[PDB]
Design an enzyme around this catalytic site. Structure first.
Site, PDB file in Angstrom:
ATOM      1  N   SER A 187      40.702  36.522  39.457  1.00  0.00           N
ATOM      2  CA  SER A 187      40.449  37.651  38.444  1.00  0.00           C
ATOM      3  C   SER A 187      41.125  37.427  37.423  1.00  0.00           C
ATOM      4  O   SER A 187      40.302  36.698  36.394  1.00  0.00           O
ATOM      5  CB  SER A 187      41.257  38.671  39.350  1.00  0.00           C
ATOM      6  OG  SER A 187      41.144  40.226  38.765  1.00  0.00           O
ATOM      7  N   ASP A 277      31.945  43.737  44.044  1.00  0.00           N
ATOM      8  CA  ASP A 277      32.972  43.897  43.168  1.00  0.00           C
ATOM      9  C   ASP A 277      32.618  44.818  42.040  1.00  0.00           C
ATOM     10  O   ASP A 277      32.086  44.557  41.162  1.00  0.00           O
ATOM     11  CB  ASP A 277      33.268  42.340  42.511  1.00  0.00           C
ATOM     12  CG  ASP A 277      34.539  42.487  42.031  1.00  0.00           C
ATOM     13  OD1 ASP A 277      35.300  43.604  41.699  1.00  0.00           O
ATOM     14  OD2 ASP A 277      35.180  41.208  42.100  1.00  0.00           O
ATOM     15  N   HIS A 306      36.482  43.176  45.618  1.00  0.00           N
ATOM     16  CA  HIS A 306      37.565  42.323  44.711  1.00  0.00           C
ATOM     17  C   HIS A 306      38.790  41.989  46.145  1.00  0.00           C
ATOM     18  O   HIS A 306      39.727  42.871  46.067  1.00  0.00           O
ATOM     19  CB  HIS A 306      38.075  43.199  43.625  1.00  0.00           C
ATOM     20  CG  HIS A 306      38.863  42.204  42.677  1.00  0.00           C
ATOM     21  ND1 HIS A 306      37.992  41.393  41.677  1.00  0.00           N
ATOM     22  CD2 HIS A 306      40.016  42.200  42.384  1.00  0.00           C
ATOM     23  CE1 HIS A 306      38.814  40.978  41.097  1.00  0.00           C
ATOM     24  NE2 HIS A 306      40.001  41.058  41.194  1.00  0.00           N
TER      25      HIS A 306
END
Ligand code: NA
Ligand code: NA
Ligand code: NA
Ligand code: NA
Ligand code: NA
Ligand code: NA
Lengths: 323, 322, 322, 322, 319, 322
Positions: A187, A277, A306
């Protein structure tokens, strides 16, 4: 035909997607000035003892000075009795998190690697030093510094230069072969992985997972329910509700958009993407991927968002064994 | 039989004592804060605003607060001032700003001066940030909580900003210092009480569901949404095992409005909505029950953190007695 | 390439023609409505109100509308006017009421008369109900849709109430019939345009995200929440197979604000928020694009059906030109 | 230890007395209601329906109720009755209608007449509206609450409609008036009890999670969804400070099924699901505990306001003993 | 905005998985496997009693050697052979209350209502598989060596067996039999009319078990088609076997059985249905081999559709 | 005061006795379970894996469990051990699998053998299903609950798999049988405790918010989400009136981890998050309070069923004392 409606772009479009965030005309001069600003600040590296102990590694707190005159922290793990120069791994953590547990990377030390894990300024780790800005808005950390007279006070620029300094420090270690250093992260850590490999092109391998900090204007235009990209909307609602300065805001975010640093990357990149996501939409990620300056490959998880991606840590471990 | 409530039954609100600890040196802390503020020259600058109307002279009011930052407030004054007249101080909601000029022109038409503070770093023109030793992005409300002493709390600087605004307004030659009021919603309600406490000359105060009261009660209630969740956000980042729980909540007691309430001398008219899960009524009455002056309340049983029909008229009628 | 959106991309809004069909006898329908209204004596009664202030004379205005029902409006007048002066008509949100007396006192301080209508059956003092042949509890907006002729639509009576209120205010001795404005939010925005269309002497109009436009477009978008879901509620109750779909939407065309917009002669300043899912921007621009007078718009891209910072000042500045 | 529940623990349900007052003149109110009904001639009209089947004669039944309104019910009769036989009255859910003809043909095959009322203004053929002095669009359930006297309550007209349907059906030559039953779900369950109370000759009654009981208890609960939230909607519109709270809940006591329950003489089989947040079990047992005849209940602990497997067979087995 | 396909395109929509090349051979083998299993029919009295009908439990053996249950309701005193109606229930439910179908018995019909294996009824026998995954009942058996162990195949053959048993009853005219059901029962109605094509009328309501690949591609938030995603997340997270999984599912896709149907079909569909999207239903409707018509409820989802029971009852009176 | 909680206040957690009944023949049930397992030859087969690394030898471990099914575990062994060494057993979350090889290589570098079981039918390589007499698709957790005897519970097969895995690893030539630990999250936490109970030679155990405890308490709670709702799903399908409630919960007591806890002799370090609505803290402490060996706990007050920062280091340090 009969393609369903996805929140994002169809995969066929992703591999040619050019991004939608403006690249400032002086992008290259901006980052050369940033790298020169960093080099003019003495790093003042101090290595201090850690409480965590294990026969597998020497664990330390690594401290250095970044831009803005701030002290920055990184976890440092080194193998016991190294004899010959060996690889190193830089790890970067997720947004609002920290470098995590010492024991989660002891297997890389067992391979003979040095591992350094940066703590981002102001997040959950030990980096608690804040660089000042002329115009402070509580609406968004990502946009901190956006209203200053020049664009050099952006908080994300300090963050990117922190990764560059860590790579410079680790590469310069006598025990570390400067040709065998890698970076990886999830991320925000995925975006920092690419920023690091771009500002320190000596990095050999890079393994980002659904990277954050790409294609800010595409993220804003998609109107996402949740996630840190909503900080852009929050800033606009507070400090420019009619969007009279929309072009100036997005042109300045272009300085810290990872997609415009991607051409500087020379590392081989292995990028992992999950297609459901909605925190880091795949289109924002491929905006940076498609501009990468070195060899590259991707891995897709169609039904995941995610979250944990089963098998990816093994894939990255096998990828990083070739160091 | 008592029916089940997310908060406390109304019967127990009127005697609720609060659940956030008061530090033993609360008085010295705030006396030191006011002395620190007085040691910084106000350096008042008043500049014309772009908004114009025959109803009021509109200006930008600038001053220096604690921490070496410039602070902004909207200033509205009668065009040709005559005798000394009342004044009204207004404070805005969390992450907002002082709002539209025209929403308070009727107070100027009554002859009042109106001053509306912009909170530091929020949606207005106060963009100066006081530094801290230990920065956490997790919470503005808890900014400064990890410094060596408790004098770097961001909320402390904010409260002293309201004190300075009151001091400047009372000192204006056209303002009768005995006829000044304060009012505000949510965060502005909490700032209304902090202002009336740190400048006890304030005559009337009209907070609406005040924020920043009874921090520890707010944390213990588990509120799904709202700014009180910043406390949980901070613990999750910097103390997930609650090894420092007592120290954090002790420091927060310095900036808990309920412990400034005994200093208030103004007559208070507090408006409360009973279905409010952003500022639960129990946290509001923790402060209300400690008020040091005359007081009354108004209840909206079926309303939450929203517009309360009739409240602006109730406040206007209340403020006509200035 | 344009990005996905729940509504239409902004570049398509300024040419969007709407979807609700314009009835072929729209003109005759509304001329007959104004004739029906004129054949009912207004029976104007003005009585003093409880709320008092030196800034204005506050009164209750009562009159008779179509259907023989008594309708109420708030009336605020300057304390001592000499010459004819401007007037402002205000209309409120769906299921709300005319609101607090004091929120409009700054317009009276300018020298204006202010009249604020209470919609029939909503939260105000207008409690008179016109009867219908076929009653369905599913929808207030579609009340009267199943009667023999289209003259019993509840929205028709409401639109004529705004026309009568404007006629009464224009006829007042101290009101200059050339200096009258209308403004309102949401339902009040649609009523602002309906009012300025049925009383074309109105000079300025300032609607904010207007409601009651482009009913068919609203139904086809299938929004999660909001008053437009009343259309779906009626269909699920009284026409689940949509056998009468065309007759229903052609009927709604009589009370669609977009088809009254060509009658407007006032200069219009329309405020729109682009994330609004209560009143989608496309339905608002269906009416905006058909306006018969000068016009401009103001956009808030990241806002929904909420407070829009700066809009009250923008409207106040706009209305100072009266 | 009793685990925490949103409602009352089951041990307390069997003794729960309700929380809604009960007017001292309840009996006189309803004796007057029935006398008002008897003074309106029924003017019964019966016409064939388009739905046809060899199992039954299907017809529309029309009558006049209180307020001078025409009311509709579905009427199904056996083809060759030959001899006086039982009848069944069915009542439907809130905002729905009497439903499909074929869903009750098995009762006709038993030899029963079936009559199914359409509630005024809901999804059926009863579209006549009785006028009120004070109209509020906020709530159908509270329609008429603000009139001079309490005789204009909409729920009173509805209850008297069920009584008239019962009186018409019992008077039919082929219906044994001592072998008549009533049944229904939700609103239809509350109407089942009101019908068996106002026509006490009814022999059996089978309500399923009945609605329209214990209004004040429902309001006091944190009900996120459902028609009981109409009470809160009314308070927010017409009494936000609850100054008339005692009058409103006292008037609602007239149309609370729990206070009609002592008049019931039918044997009752009540089905309740314990996770029901639309009609909380406590409100249902307020009525159950006051029933004037033999009674039994059926519990579904893990179900909400939904289909309850086995209940239609249980009711059918119950109604075969007619 | 357009969650599914606009109505203009539904009547030509071809579905998102091609008919398997050996589809006919697969189902001929399935029916032959069924015929080689003795039905061993047992009829036992039920507890529910009424003068309107004889109520019984009907037990038989299906493929995999398990015992399967259906409710059986028959008229009390029939003279000549008469019609019959087969009913199928929703996913994870059961055949429901006895009294909800007594009006068909009053017309003189026999009514049989199957309980699906492992769901809320009395069919509690489980056929074994080589590779068991708890992620999805619908995909149970999809990873076995051959495709003949699919749980949905056992289910489809149960409807065929029930129809065969009911048609063979002495008092049932085998040429006057109908089938109907909601959701899963709607898909089973179509499978039943395909594997026993003598069925005269069929009335499915928003049928399930059609166009699996289209359902997975739509990313539905909610409902039983999400079992496909759950299976992929468990046993193939990178979709390395995506092509084999969906083309194995093509054997048990109701749309590819639709060409065998000869019954007249009356299909009811609601257009705001996000559990069974209209496109997946029309994938089957467009391939039906007999006369057909549809009924639309534009503003309704996966819920009760007012008037549909009367429409089906009127439709089934022509039996 | 009044600290409302979704679960039990922390003061009562330390004394909570559980709510799920313990069968009187619990000891006989599990001694029979271990004897049944012993009568099935394990037929251990070890095969090399495709994942390769110089840090460890990686293999697939296969054995036969109860029901005649093959079960898989990941096996990682240190390369060239020179003396018997510790071993670690790891168990995974509900519907998951044993996970990545590389996540446990640091334990192998310490010199430990690591074995990670794949639960039958979940995301791993154990794909063999033991048959039941009565199959319900409603719940894996309650699979086998309706058979004639309780020896066909799916959970009993799963618990005996952990026993056999522990027995195999304990019997390995280079594994010190006195230095073996178990650890796991959620389902893996419950399996950790079941393993240390059925193989009491296990020395250390580190469960994180254990699942499979106190089934009745779990059902009695709200709990909108999570695997404990399989109990409700089963009741809604196969016992909607709860006529067999006492039988169902009595059987679950055989496979309730809290009643195996007295057999545990390992030192236990249990980690709990206090806002966990998937595994409520009360259900976990029902087992913790009955543990038969030394024990300690770690709390995360503001966390739910998620990653708990610092826990992997805490467990690693705990397991270094092996
Ligand atoms: Na080096
Ligand atoms: Na002064
Ligand atoms: Na005039
Ligand atoms: Na009779
Ligand atoms: Na036959
Ligand atoms: Na050993």
């Amino acid at each position: 035909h009969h393609v369903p409606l996805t929140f994002d772009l169809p995969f066929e479009e992703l591999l040619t997607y050019p991004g939608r965030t403006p690249r400032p005309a002086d992008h290259d001069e901006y980052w050369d000035r940033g790298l020169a600003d960093l080099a003019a600040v003495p790093a003042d590296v101090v290595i201090e003892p850690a409480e965590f102990t294990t026969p597998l590694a020497r664990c330390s707190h690594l401290w250095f000075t970044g831009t803005g005159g701030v002290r920055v922290h990184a976890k440092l793990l080194r193998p016991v009795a190294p004899v010959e120069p060996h690889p190193a791994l830089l790890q970067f953590h997720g947004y609002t998190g920290n470098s995590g547990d010492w024991s989660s990377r002891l297997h890389y030390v067992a391979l003979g690697y040095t591992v350094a894990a940066l703590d981002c300024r102001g997040q959950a780790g030990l980096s608690v030093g804040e660089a000042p800005v002329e115009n402070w808005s509580m609406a968004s950390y990502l946009l901190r510094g956006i209203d200053d007279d020049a664009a050099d006070n952006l908080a994300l620029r300090h963050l990117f230069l922190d990764t560059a300094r860590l790579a410079q420090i680790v590469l310069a270690m006598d025990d570390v072969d400067p040709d065998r250093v890698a970076a990886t992260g999830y991320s925000q850590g995925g975006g920092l992985t690419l920023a690091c490999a771009a500002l320190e092109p000596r990095i050999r391998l890079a393994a980002p997972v659904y990277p954050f900090l790409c294609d800010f204007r595409r993220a804003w235009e998609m109107d996402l329910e949740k996630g840190p990209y909503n900080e852009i909307t929050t800033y606009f609602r507070a400090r420019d509700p009619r969007h009279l300065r929309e072009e100036e805001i997005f042109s300045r975010l272009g300085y810290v958009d990872v997609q415009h640093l991607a051409p500087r990357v020379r590392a081989e990149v292995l990028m992992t993407v999950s297609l459901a996501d909605k925190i880091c939409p795949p289109s924002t990620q491929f905006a940076a991927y498609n501009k990468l300056g070195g060899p590259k490959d991707y891995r897709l998880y169609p039904d995941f968002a995610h979250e944990t991606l089963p098998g990816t840590d093994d894939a990255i471990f096998t990828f990083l064994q070739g160091l």
